[PDB]
Amino acid sequence: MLLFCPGCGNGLIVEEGQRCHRFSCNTCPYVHNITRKVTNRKYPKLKEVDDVLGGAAAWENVDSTAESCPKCEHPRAYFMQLQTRSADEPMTTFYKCCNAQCGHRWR
Amino acid sequence: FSIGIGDVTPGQGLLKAKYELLNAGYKKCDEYIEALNTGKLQQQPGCTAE
Numbered sequence A: 001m002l003l004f005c006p007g008c009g010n011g012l013i014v015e016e017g018q019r020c021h022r023f024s025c026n027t028c029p030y031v032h033n034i035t036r037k038v039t040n041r042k043y044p045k046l047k048e049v050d051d052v053l054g055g056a057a058a059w060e061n062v063d064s065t066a067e068s069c070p071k072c073e074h075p076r077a078y079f080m081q082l083q084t085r086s087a088d089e090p091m092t093t094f095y096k097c098c099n100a101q102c103g104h105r106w107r
Numbered sequence B: 001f002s003i004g005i006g007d008v009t010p011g012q013g014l015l016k017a018k019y020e021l022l023n024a025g026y027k028k029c030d031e032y033i034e035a036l037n038t039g040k041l042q043q044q045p046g047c048t049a050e
Ligand SMILES: [Zn+2]
Pocket: A005, A006, A007, A008, A009, A010, A025, A026, A027, A028, A030
């Protein structure tokens, strides 16, 4: 990440001193000792998952005493939750029911 | 052997049929418009929702 000197406002570089790593200016004496953990997270875009779960994938989220689906009122349906973008997104819930003479997709 | 304006004039059997087709076809389009902007649209494989 860009961080800039309070004195002259040139761009800082990270270098190493005799006791700590420092943010340092190239044009003035200013240095800033890294005393504690500092971080910067990118969170890039993941792949699409839409065509990855279709067609009898290896899902696993089903559990004992799980709810029945609302149309058929039978537990013959899978349900899962996934991030669609990066993991800062709140996870979305989705479910699909597959029964005899009955095909549907629901949200 | 001749062509005239009466050879391309739509008879009453078509003008009723055409009105039904337009209303049915436009209303099916309007529902998918609503399903894109404000709901679920069954996204066909290999293409974006638009
Ligand atoms: Zn500076």
